[PDB]
Every structure is written in C-alpha cells, then in structure tokens.
Amino acid sequence: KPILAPEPLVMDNLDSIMEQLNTWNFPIFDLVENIGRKCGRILSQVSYRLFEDMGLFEAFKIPIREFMNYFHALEIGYRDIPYHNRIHATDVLHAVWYLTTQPIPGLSTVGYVFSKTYNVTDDKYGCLSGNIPALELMALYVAAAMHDYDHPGRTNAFLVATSAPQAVLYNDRSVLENHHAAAAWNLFMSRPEYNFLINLDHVEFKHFRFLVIEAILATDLKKHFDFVAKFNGKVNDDVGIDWTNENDRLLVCQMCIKLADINGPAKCKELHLQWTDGIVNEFYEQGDEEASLGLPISPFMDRSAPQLANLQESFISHIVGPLCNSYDSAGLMPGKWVERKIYCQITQHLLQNHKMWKKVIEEEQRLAGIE
Amino acid sequence: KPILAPEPLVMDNLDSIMEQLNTWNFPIFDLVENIGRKCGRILSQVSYRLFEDMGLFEAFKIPIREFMNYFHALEIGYRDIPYHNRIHATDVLHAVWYLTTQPIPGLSTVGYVFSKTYNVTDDKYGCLSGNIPALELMALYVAAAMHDYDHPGRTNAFLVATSAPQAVLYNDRSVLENHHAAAAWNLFMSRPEYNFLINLDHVEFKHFRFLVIEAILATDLKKHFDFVAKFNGKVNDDVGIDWTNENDRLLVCQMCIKLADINGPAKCKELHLQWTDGIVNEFYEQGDEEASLGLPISPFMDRSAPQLANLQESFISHIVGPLCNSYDSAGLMPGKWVERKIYCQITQHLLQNHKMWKKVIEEEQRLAGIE
Amino acid sequence: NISVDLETNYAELVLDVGRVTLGENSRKKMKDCKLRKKQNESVSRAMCALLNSGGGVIKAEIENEDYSYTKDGIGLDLENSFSNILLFVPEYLDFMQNGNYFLIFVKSWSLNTSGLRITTLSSNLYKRDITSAKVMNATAALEFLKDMKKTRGRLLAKRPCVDIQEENNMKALAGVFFDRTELDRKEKLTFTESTHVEIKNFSTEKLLQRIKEILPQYVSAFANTDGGYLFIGLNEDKEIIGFKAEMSDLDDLEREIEKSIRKMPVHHFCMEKKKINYSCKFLGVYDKGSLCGYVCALRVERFCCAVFAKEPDSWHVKDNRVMQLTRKEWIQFMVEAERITYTPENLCRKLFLQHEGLKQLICEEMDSVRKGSLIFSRSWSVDLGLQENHKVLCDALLISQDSPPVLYTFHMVQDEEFKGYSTQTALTLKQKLAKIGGYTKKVCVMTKIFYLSPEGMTSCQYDLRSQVIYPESYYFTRRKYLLKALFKALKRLKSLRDQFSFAENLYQIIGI
Amino acid sequence: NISVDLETNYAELVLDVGRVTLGENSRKKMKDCKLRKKQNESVSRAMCALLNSGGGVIKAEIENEDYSYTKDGIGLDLENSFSNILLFVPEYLDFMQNGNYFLIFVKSWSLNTSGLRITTLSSNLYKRDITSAKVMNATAALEFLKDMKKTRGRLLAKRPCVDIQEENNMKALAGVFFDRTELDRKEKLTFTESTHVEIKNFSTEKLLQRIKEILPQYVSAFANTDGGYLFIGLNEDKEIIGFKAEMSDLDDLEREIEKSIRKMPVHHFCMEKKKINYSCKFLGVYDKGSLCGYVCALRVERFCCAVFAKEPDSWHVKDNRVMQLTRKEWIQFMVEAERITYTPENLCRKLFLQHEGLKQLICEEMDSVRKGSLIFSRSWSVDLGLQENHKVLCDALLISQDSPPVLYTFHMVQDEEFKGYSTQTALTLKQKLAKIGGYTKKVCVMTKIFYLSPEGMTSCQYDLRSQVIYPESYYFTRRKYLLKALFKALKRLKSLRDQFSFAENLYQIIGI
Ligand SMILES: [C][C]N([C][C])C1=[C][C]=C(C2=N[N]C(=O)[C][C]2[C])[C]=C1N([O])=O
Ligand SMILES: [C][C]N([C][C])C1=[C][C]=C(C2=N[N]C(=O)[C][C]2[C])[C]=C1N([O])=O
Ligand SMILES: [Mg+2]
Ligand SMILES: [Mg+2]
Ligand SMILES: [Mn+2]
Ligand SMILES: [Mn+2]
Ligand SMILES: [Zn+2]
Ligand SMILES: [Zn+2]
C-alpha cells in the first residue's frame, strides 16, 4: 500500500503565504489552517517551495513526482502528537533554510547553490549556501525533514526507564534519533516511487546518506553539550572554521540543525507561547503515562502542579542560550548592519523571551510568598 | 516456545576435561567432540564451570535453573557458521576468565571475587579479579558470552555495502555489535525463565546492563584503533590505571574482551590453524555471496586465489600485535617469574605464529618467483 | 630561620623572616655582605614557599631605622631575586610598609604556558654551554627531565679523508693526556676547553676547600651533557704548573673527591640504577729531573639520568613549617602533568525556619550588596577537608564582584570565641581556590562572626575586614571566575553535593 | 651582509657570514669592538635564520691566521650568544674547521615543552621589573602575548584607616610632581623609582642622541606593565638638576620624542586600534630667582596591547634571502598553535619491467645495506612541492638505520648534469622532514645520480657522500622515526598516495 501524493503537486492557494517564507517569524500555523489538518500537506508544500527557491530540482535533476510522493509519505508518518508533529518538521526545515540562505554579515564566500531571495551583488553579506556544497545542503534539508520522524511523544529517559522495545533495540543509545533515521531511510528504500535520488551516483548516494544520518543523530539533546564543546573548541582555534574541510562543514550543518530544532524560544512571543503550550501538553501526557505505570512523575510533567515558566527559563538559559551564543560567536548568525554594529532578530527575540519568563517567575514567587 | 535447558544441568562425563580450564591452550574442540555437535551444550557447561570456580552463584544468589536455561537459549541462538558459532563464544569466555583470574606478575591488589585456582597466599602475583568488582566481572563474562550472538557470518562492510536490513536499522553504525547486544538482551527479557538476575536491585541491574552493552560494543574492529589509542593514552599517563575509577575499570574490561575476541593467533599452532581455517571458510562463503550478488570480491575472500598466509600475517602484525603489546605494557598480561624476568605464554605463541606466517609468505614468494 | 606567624590576624600563611634591611642605599651600603645574602636567601625562600603553598604574606621586621618605603624603595638584590623567581613581578607581588613591618603579599603560582607547576630558586642541575657549567633554569630543567622520563633515561662512520677539526679531537687529546704516566713542567697543551674539557687552576691551600664547592657542579654538568675531563693544575695559558702536595695530601684529596661525588644527589628514570662513573688520577710534574707537583685529572662518564650538584632548591609550607621539597617530590612536580542567590535551597529554608533571627540578619547584611551569591553549609570546614566544629551552627560564603569573598560563621555560644576556627577555614578556602580551584588572580577571604541569641538578637563579634588591610588589588574580584574556581575545588575535594543550583530537573529530563 | 651560498656541494642552506675572527684569545684581543659585535650579530642572525628555516650550515671565513679550532676554541661572546638562543647547545650545534672555513651545522628548531615555535634573538618587548626595564625572554614574551590574545587585550575600595606606604603613594607623588608649573633647584624628591617611576640623568650633548635610543625601551616597558612617569634631569640623589636648553632646543627635543614614540611598532589584539597615549612636559628649574635648566617629564599611559621598542629580532630564509620576520608573522608564530622494503609495489614492478638494468643496479646498491626501506617515485621533486623535471626517469629514497637518507636520481640523458636538481630536492626533503615531518634529530640527505644506458649499462655520475663531510652525529639516523616523519610530511603535503605499504586490504575488510 504505497502512500502516493495527491495528484495536484503544487497548491496555488498557498502561493501568497509562501511569499512570507523569507522572514524568520513565518506564520506556520496560519498555513496549517489554510491547508487543512486532515490532508496534512504542509511539509510537502513547504519543502517544494524551498527546493524551487534553491533550485535543487534542476541542480540534481530531482524528479518532482518521487520527491512529492516521499515527502507526503513522510508527512503521513508523523503522528498527531501536540509538539513533535509535521508542523515541527516544517518549522525546522524552514529554520534550516533561513539559517543557510539568509544574508550573514561579514561571512566570506568561496557545485554551489544560492537562493532566489539572496542578493549576490552586495559584498557586505554572505550566506552559508555559498560555502556549503549543494549536496550537503540538500542532505541538511532532508535530515531536518527527517529529524523527528515517527516520534512517539516520549523522551529518551522515559523509554530507557520503562524498557521500551525501541530502547532495547538501540541499546539505550540515542533511541529516538536512531529510530527516526532508521525509519526514514527504511521508508525511503521501501518503495521505488519514493526514490527521488535516482540521478545520484553510488558514491554520492552513500555520502548523502551519511550526512543525513549524522545530522539526524546530532539532534539528540543528551549529546548537546558535547557538540557545543566541540564547536567552541573548533571556533576558538586560531585556524577557525575551514570551509574546505568536510568535517568542519558537517559540524556546521549539525550545529545548524541543532539550533533549528530548538528555535521556538528564538521566535516572536506568539509562536514561542504556542510551541511552549504544545511541548508542555506533550510533557503532561508523558507524566500521565508515568503515573499510570507507577513510576515517579518526572519534573515539569505534573499537570497538577505546572512549572511551565521554570521549565522555559531553564531551557532558554541552559540549552538555547549557550547554543545561540556559540552560533553567534562563530559568526554564522544572520543579521543586518546598522549605521558599524550587527542587529540580529533571533538574539533579540531570545533575550525578550528570557526576560518575560524571568518576570513571570518573579511574579509567581512573589504571589506564593504573599500567601 | 521457550527454549528450556535439558534436565541434567551438570554433565559428569566432562568433569575430567574441565580440569584443564586453568590452562591457556584449552582443548575446546575435544570438548565439542565429547559433548556432541547436535546438543550444543558446550557454552552452558563451560559457563557453569567458570561461575562455580568464581563463586558468583553464591555471591549474587544466582538461580541455577534460570542461568542454565538462558545460556542454553544463547547456545541455540548461535548459528552453525564456520567461525562465529558457539565454539567461538566459549573460547572468548574461557579467554576472559583466564585473563581475569590467572596470576599476573607485579599486579597490586586492593564485593570482590577470587577464583578457586588462584593462590592468595603468594604476594608476588596478582589477578584482575582482585581489582575489579564481582558485578563488573560477571558483566564482562556475560558480555563475552553475548559478544557475537546471532552473527550472520558477514562483516560490517558487506552489510553496509549491500544495504542489508540490519545495516539500515542501525544506520551503518556498528551493525553487528549493536545487533548482537540487542538480540541478547531481547532474549533475556523475553522470558521470565531466563531471568537469573532477579536478586539484583534496580540500580545494579541497570549498571550491569550498561557494562554488558559497552563490553559487547567494544568488540567492533572498526573502532579497534580508537580503543587502542585511548588505552595507550591512559596508560602512558603518570597517573596510570586507577582501579577506583569506574571508567578505567570499564576500559580495562573492554580491552580484556577485545583481546579475548582475537585470541586465536595467540594460542598454540593447532588451535591457531583450526581457527584460521574456520575464519577463511567464512570469508570464502562471504566472497561467494558477493560474487553471486555481482559486487566485486573483497580481498582475502576469493576461494580461487587464497591469500591465507598474507591475511594472517597482516592480522597479527596490525590488529593482534599492537593490542597484545599495549595489554602487556599496561602490565595486565598473565605470566610467570623466571629465576627477575617475566615469561608470557601468550606473547611467545604470538611471536611463534607470526614467524611461521612470515616463513610461509617468504616460501610462497620464492616459489612464485621461481615459476 | 623562617617561621609561620600564628599570632597574625590575616586569614593566610604569614611567614616571618626576621629583621631585614630595606632600601636601595641602605642595602648597597651594608658592611656585612654575609648578612645581606642571608636576608636575601630568607626572603627568597619565603617567597618560593608561599608561591608553592597557595600564596600568603611575608612579614619582615624593618631592621634599619627611619626607613620610608616611598623614599627609599626595596633594594636591587631583592628585586633581582624576585625577577629571577617570577616572570611578571606586578602580577604576583604587592609591597606594603605597615608600621615597623614590611609585608610582601604573594599570589599563588598558577600553571601557565611555560608548563611549570612549582617555583624553584635553583634546580641545581648543571649543563655544559660549550665551555661553561650553567645551572639549568626552570624551563631547561623541565625540558631535560621530561625528555629523560619519556625515553626512560638516555660505532664509527666512514667519512671522506678530509683534514677537519672537531670537538672529538679535543676529547681524544684530553683522553691521551689523561693516560700519561708523568708530565713535564712548562709544556703547552694541544687542546683547550670544550663541551668535554674543563681546565681550572687552584692554589694548594684553597684546593681542598674548593673541591667540596665547585667540583659537584662541574661533575653534574659533565654527567648531564656528555661526560668529560676536568684538569686541575694548569694555568690560563694552558701551561702545566700543578700543585705541590705529599702522598698523604694526595690520599686526603682523593678521599674528599670521592666523598663529594658520592654526596651528590642522583635521580634515576631507568630500571637499572647506576652510580656516577668517575676516574680520578694524579699525574706527577717533573721539572729538570725533579718532581714539582701534581695535576688532578678527573674523567666523568656520561650518566644515564639526572645528576644534581645539590638537592633542588624548592620550598613549600607543610604542617605550619617551611620545608624544602625532597628530590622525589620535586621530580614528581616537574615531570608529572596535572539579586542574591541562596543555595542550597533546602538547607537555606531549613536554617531560616529553625532560626528566625538568622534570616533577618542575612537580609540586613545583604541589603548593602549590589549582586552576589551566598552559599550556606552546615560546616564549611568539613567541605575543605578540615575537622568539624559542632558548636558552629552553620557557615555562609558570600561571593560578590565589588567585594572579596566573605565567610560568615554563626554560633549559639555566648562565652566562646571562634576566631581561630574561622581564620583557619578562610585560609584553607583561599588555598583551595588558588591551587585546586584554579583561580589565577589575587584573592583574599574576609570573615564575619555572629552570635545568634535564642531570643533572636544578633551581634557581630568579629569583623576581619575592619582589622586587616590589603592592597587594593585584593578588594576587587571576578565573580564568575570565583564561582568557577569554587566549583572546581569542590568537585576535586569530593564535597560538591548541592552548592550550585544546576538545573537537575532539566538534565534529568534530558538524561545528562 | 648574509648571503645564501649557491656554489656549495651540501644539500642544505649554507649561509656565508663573511670573515669572522675565531678563538678565545683572538676574539678577546680584538681592537675594534664594533667589528667584533658586528661579526657576533651576523653569526647570531644566520643561526636564527637556519633554526627557523629547517637547519643548515653557517660558513665563516676564518679571518685570523694560524687558527686551530682544537687549540684556540670559538670565543666567549659567540658561545654566550649561542647559549642565549638555544637551551642545549650540543643538541643543535656542531662545529667543524674545514680548511680555511668554519662550519656550524645547525639543526632545525623543534617544538618542545616550552611551546616556542620559532627562535628570536630579542623579542624587543620590555616589561618593568620593579625598577628596571628588561626585554622579555622567549617564554615571558610568549606568555604575555598569549594572555593578551586570549582576553582581546587588557573605583577605590574602602580600607581601614591605617598609615601604610605602597607603590600607589610613589605614583601619586610622581603625578603631583608632573603637574608642577615650576621647580626649585637642589630640592629632594619625596618619591623614588618604582614600577611606575623611572628617573634618569643625561648630559645636554648626549640627551638628543640617547632619546632616540633608550626612550623607546622605557616607553615600551611602561606601556606594557602599568604606564608610569619618566623624569630626565635628576641626579642619583634625587636632587633636581635639569639640563640647560633654549626654547628652540625644547621644541626640537619634543619633536624628536614624538618621532621616536610614533616610530615604535605596535600590535593590537583588540577591535579598537589605539595610539600610544603619552604626555611630554618641560618643567623649568629656578635657582636664586633665575632659570637654571629644564626637567623632562614623560607620562606614558597603560596600553591595551603589545608595544615594541623595535621590530622583533627574528629571522628566516625565504627565496634564498635572509629576511627578518615581519611583526605580523612573528606574532602569528608566537600566539597561534600548530630485508629491503620496495614501495609502492606497482611502481616498482613497472620500473623494473620497463628497465632491466635498473633492477640490477638497485640490487647491487642494496647488497651493502643491512636493513632499510626504498621508496620509488616518478619525481620526488613534485611530492615535495617543487617543479617537475621530465628528463629524470624516477627518484628513489633510501632510509636505513646505519646510514643517512640517500636520494637516488636516475636519468637517460648522457650529456646533461642533474646535480642541481638532485641537490635542491634533497635540501627540500631535509627541510620538510625537519619542520613538517617533525623529526627532532640531526639529519642529512645524500644524493646519488645514475645514468641508465639503453643497453643496460649503469654508471654513478655523482656521489654526494664522497664529496661532502658531516659530523658523525649526522651519519646515524633512527629508521622508525625517519619513516614516521616522512609519513607525516607526505600527509601534510597532500602527496601521500602509495608510499607506505599499509594493509589497505585488511582495513578495507574491517571498514577503516
Ligand atoms: C524531546 C526534546 N525535549 C524534551 C526533553 C524538548 C523538546 C522541546 C522543548 C521546547 N521547549 N520550549 C519551546 O519553546 C518549544 C521547544 C523548543 C524542550 C525540550 N526539553 O528539552 O525540555
Ligand atoms: C568478523 C571479524 N573479522 C572479519 C573482519 C575477523 C574475524 C576473525 C579473524 C581471525 N583471524 N585469525 C584467526 O586466527 C582467528 C580469528 C582471530 C580475523 C578477522 N579479520 O579482521 O579479518
Ligand atoms: Mg528530536
Ligand atoms: Mg564480533
Ligand atoms: Mn526535533
Ligand atoms: Mn567476536
Ligand atoms: Zn638512570
Ligand atoms: Zn589594543
């Protein structure tokens, strides 16, 4: 039973909203409402728009039919859980596209692929698409589309503690990420109609698969500090980032996908609050399952005593904060020149959200102390 | 359909040959002939003898019935392939027991478990059993019993190149070792009758599982040089090996299981030749499968043009040689004082086998040059 | 003659070096050069001990009267010694004339790019700089020792027939000269000094005295570089002169040489321990058919490992005593590589609920602090590895950017004084921060002692800051680096349980 | 006045430093001290260049007649310079008197525990050792530069009212003295020299000459340590004397000071480039109501980054020219971290099948070798990064334990000479082994050139070993370490394809 894509591959009614694909605060939920929750074609349409903008369809002679069929199957694979659904995959794909394509102040540029929304005439800006080969960029985009495939709505710790079959299968080593990559590649290789990489040679296909698997496995938060330390050590080196080195480019792509996977706190207030609501709903479901199983309820997963503000503040200060700081210090953070200083929307939004959470925590503590 | 062990748990007819379990050149094939190839109870009987010698049955209150049932199921799991069969598992278990228990000259000793064949009165010798806790030793023995479980007779490279389902499942990352560990633990957790660790608490069971998985995954030869480099760096440090550190003990256990997995060249001439014949038969079967599939025949796997001597010489000089040298330099190699110098049977056997292979290679080259 | 001052109010090791003359003019005009050298040696030893023991203060009684630090200074020899010990004097040393005493505040030695773990006045390892024997500096000694440790210690080649001259020619000529049974007076040598040849002339009366003094350093240099020959009895122009002596004098000199060589410390990095292989010979000098004197020829073979002229001159403070580091310890150091936050929450809540006045006192104390972190413990002395004091209710450490760290001790005993306990705890905390913690800046720890009355009355019995004075550099500290050093020290002391409020919940969810 | 000798037969960089007087007595009796200092400077520059350029030979014409190296030696000043450059002279330097020339064989500088990547005669960075301005040694300069690079460059605290004296008192007194409009002759200062105060007395005639010379080093020291005040016109006893000058003389002196300060090299590790902030003032001295002279007061503010008195004195050899390292290159080096085997099998088989006499010649040459490795290439010059020579059939490198590495060049052209190509290839190979390869021992490369006749006749046209002579240390090499260094150099040169016979089959099976 092959899950073939709907006959209209391109939806014209979305052509307006896709025009806002060039801004960081993309109204993705409005796109979900426009497309419809039943069909769930958001990821396929967004991926098609991004591939057209890059031109990877003509660069690699990618067949449209196979690409659309496989991405529709990938959309179907995502479960209807509050956070790790196809909406999150679309958001991560849009974020990696934004990070790779949008101008970066002071980034020197060296086949290669450039977005149609980038101005090559200007010499004061650069983009990661001008330093990363097209094959690696396509691998990064595909991995971002596959980063959380078939997510069960549970964390790695819950699966390990409960001795879930997935945990036993992968020997309690990056259970979620390994499962996502394995399921995505099994789906890709299961049907001939999903093979949109038929025009790649044997060596290129192997390299693409390796890059996609590495990028997917980089999304694990258990190894987050390892990646952060490695990236900081590479950047602080006098040599710096070498774009002619395969390992350095792989590390840069892994950092980009890691930053895009937790980009929620770095958005505007409305998107950040909606993503926080989704993730805390998923946490509450996991905590209810833990209570049913008799295990002690994990922190922040108790619906009776929510700690949403504390969770968000800790996540921003410990996970998102250092990662964004390292990415900006490396010089890969998109921004604009102000007249010379650099203005970044992502960093400003992260600071504003962190201040909001600190204010909420202080207000809650004051209210508790009064009572 | 639980695979329950035969009603007689202990075989008396073997009690004589088990007396030779205290020597490195254990006639394992004679034991296979005595027991019988149909029943395949060699691994269970050898494991029972070793556990009785250590006393882990009384130390951890291990039930005999569950232990025997699970080890018989483990024996059944091993396939009848020329090399990676239950005979290899028994050999590796005997080798890890020999390395951990037999006296080591100059090794200082610090619950703990000592073998019944060790003289504690003498102060000039030590054993790894006196510095490694009983739980870690049991984990090492179980991992050695599980190191190559359900081996398909094919290398990691063959599985990756042919896009085997096991390779896709584990994302081309230690396919064989991950499969072995996952299958062994799934078999252990599948039936209540195989749970011989019921007397361990929750934390101890988790630590035991972690140690077993780490030891099993250490057996991969793709990461052999990584482990060798890490061990050399730890040993050459002025601090040296710290037996009070969990990480150092885990590394020592991993090195022991790695050395025991390739102990074949370190044995006497007859055992080494038999193991070489088995491994080259497995290589020839793999090469025949590669030729059938149309892939180019891998080196040393061409039955038409054998290179057995070259393969053995390369394996000894590149894999077994440096590993044995590092293990001996660390000071963990068993031996005896000669009157003060240290005599090691393992190193002498390895040198003799390497010289034999060099002589064979020189003779073959001379014969080829004459023609 | 260096003693640890136990009567000082400072929360650090104070070493008293006795009366020291200060001032450039005063020190350059000292009649007794021996006394000046002794004072310099005492100050240098105290500075080295403080550098190796976590920093402290050197207190010296100003011997000369009417001495003003601003008008007179310190002294050229003392400054030269400080420069020899420390690459950057202002980074480690502060000077203060307090009344009749002179205080040298010494920061702890910190590991840097040079790789040195300790400071040494003189490694007493000599090498051959073509013609001279020089004592290896800290970097040279470090390189030599590490190279020997790494390698477990340390025929002819056909060449074209070309008339060339090398050091091997001088070595061969010296060897031939060594084997001569007798010598003729007023004959010129065919060789000169080189890496393997040293030639010295000594008087008969001073020969015995100088053998015990200068022979060890030349023997160490030869055994360390390539071996060689030492010839005593030859003047500047390489003419054979010798020294007049009797057979009994020759025997006594040979015995003295043997004792001096066997007294030299030797450290072996190899499996086979060996002695210093030397050969001493006396060659008669004949002038007009009569014996004039004797020439002493000493052949020192190349040594496998380090040879010391004396024990290495490195010092530290242990058990309140200034002790010179033993050779084994010195070798091991050289060759072997290495708002307001209230934490922990549970302990703070328990202390505030059990004692109501404690919370009010803490609020009153912290109202004057712009930003900082306050860490409570049942006994900060235990966390530093010292003995527990059960009379102390709790201890509090305050780390702020505008002020040096302050340790708050609280007690319920009205008639007992806890000055010594708090001072020792602060001293140990400073030492742990400097050495184990890794803090690389000048740091001082103040103490405040409070009595908690059962009715809730709080009184400040002892305030260290108002009774001691430091250079301004000690009053400004880096809060983030202080917290990092404290975290590292607590982790290495196996006393880090809940001092830092890490997000355990978040890491537990993630699995880290 | 140092030139690369292109007429030498050695396969290494030979630097000719001209006529040099040698011998201890000869050099100590040189009437012209300027000539002796110039010769010492030339030898030191050549040695530094060879150390930084992969090693080589310093060839010096022996100026003095009847000079014997064995009888006379080298010279105290030269040995002191060598000791200053190198911690262990015997490890790097070999001396040989060949006829009328003196050869100093210099090994390449190797990275060691000190962390130095290059050798410097003088970093020209000065610091303040309490009262003196001293040029930072290599280790001190390394630490200073790394500390500044790591940090992108570099109010009052309440204290108890205790009458104390510190360096801040001297600095404040000097600052007050700086702002005085006029001074009185023969009055005593209330302060003395310190980390922030320097006082010098200069004559009127020599003032202009010494401003261009000694002012840069004191300005560098002040800008590097903490800033300070320099006072010119005060005698030893701190009495105000001054120097007599006119207004035009004052203007000229101020212009000279400004030019000297602006000439000083400055390197910035920060984002905001800054100039040296200095203030020069002239204070009149009045005696009995009349103007005696002027006192020059120079206030140098603390600088954010490194200040050089002169360009760093580091040299190397580039494009066959001895060039001083630029400030940027020196800073980058300081602060930025770093039987017989016939391989490859395919190329050896092809060469032996195409040319039958080549195999016989190789067998004849290798019959005298106990054990070693022979590596063949189409052109070893290409693998080292040089231009290809199409006339050369192939090159062979022989690495053996009993002999130095030998490069075998084979050619089919009877009437052409390949001495220069082979010599350049051997020189480049030695340099790559020493620097890129990481070989830390003395190494020399010999060359042998053979003509392969079409009929199979082989003749040895050129044999380097029989025409040049080295110290014995160069004739014994470590085969395993040579192979490791060659492997590392080939890997870093992107020319490692099949030189080493690794078990690719075994690694391919394993998957490595
Ligand atoms: C499954 C990963 N993870 C649970 C451990 C997680 C997912 C999403 C968010 C999250 N929080 N806030 C948002 O704004 C949306 C996303 C980024 C946080 C976590 N986390 O580590 O707790
Ligand atoms: C499956 C591991 N491996 C194949 C890559 C392998 C197994 C066994 C032996 C082997 N060879 N010789 C013997 O004596 C028996 C065993 C140790 C060698 C290899 N190998 O790496 O080629
Ligand atoms: Mg994920
Ligand atoms: Mg295996
Ligand atoms: Mn994700
Ligand atoms: Mn195995
Ligand atoms: Zn020794
Ligand atoms: Zn600057």
Task: Please explain how this structure is put together.
It is classed as rna binding protein. The entry lists the keywords complex, velcrin, molecular glue, dnmdp, RNA binding protein. The complex is a heterotetramer, with two copies of chain A (371 residues) and two copies of chain C (512 residues). Chain A is mostly helical. Chain A starts with 27 loop residues before the first helix and ends with a helix. Helix content of chain A is 58%, strand content 3%. Chain A is globular. Chain A has one domain (12-282): 3'5'-cyclic nucleotide phosphodiesterase, catalytic domain (Catalytic domain of cyclic nucleotide phosphodiesterase 4b2b), CATH 1.10.1300. With 512 residues, chain C is an alpha+beta fold. Chain C has three domains: 3-110, Translation Initiation Factor IF3 (2-Layer Sandwich), CATH 3.30.110; 126-154 and 166-311, no CATH class; 340-510, no CATH class. In chain C, helix 11 (345-354) packs across helix 12 (356-366) and helix 14 (419-437) packs across helix 15 (479-492). The radius of gyration of chain C is 31 Å and the shape is elongated. The relative contact order of chain C is 0.10. Classes of the chains: A mainly alpha (371), C alpha+beta (512). The interface between C and D is large, with 73 and 73 residues. Bound molecules: the ligand [C][C]N([C][C])C1=[C][C]=C(C2=N[N]C(=O)[C][C]2[C])[C]=C1N([O])=O (2 copies), magnesium ion (MG) (2 copies), manganese (II) ion (MN) (2 copies) and zinc ion (2 copies). Residues 155, 221, 262, 264-265, 272, 275-276, 279, 312, 315 of chain A line the site of one copy of the ligand [C][C]N([C][C])C1=[C][C]=C(C2=N[N]C(=O)[C][C]2[C])[C]=C1N([O])=O. Residues 147-148, 176, 219 of chain B line the site of one magnesium ion (MG).
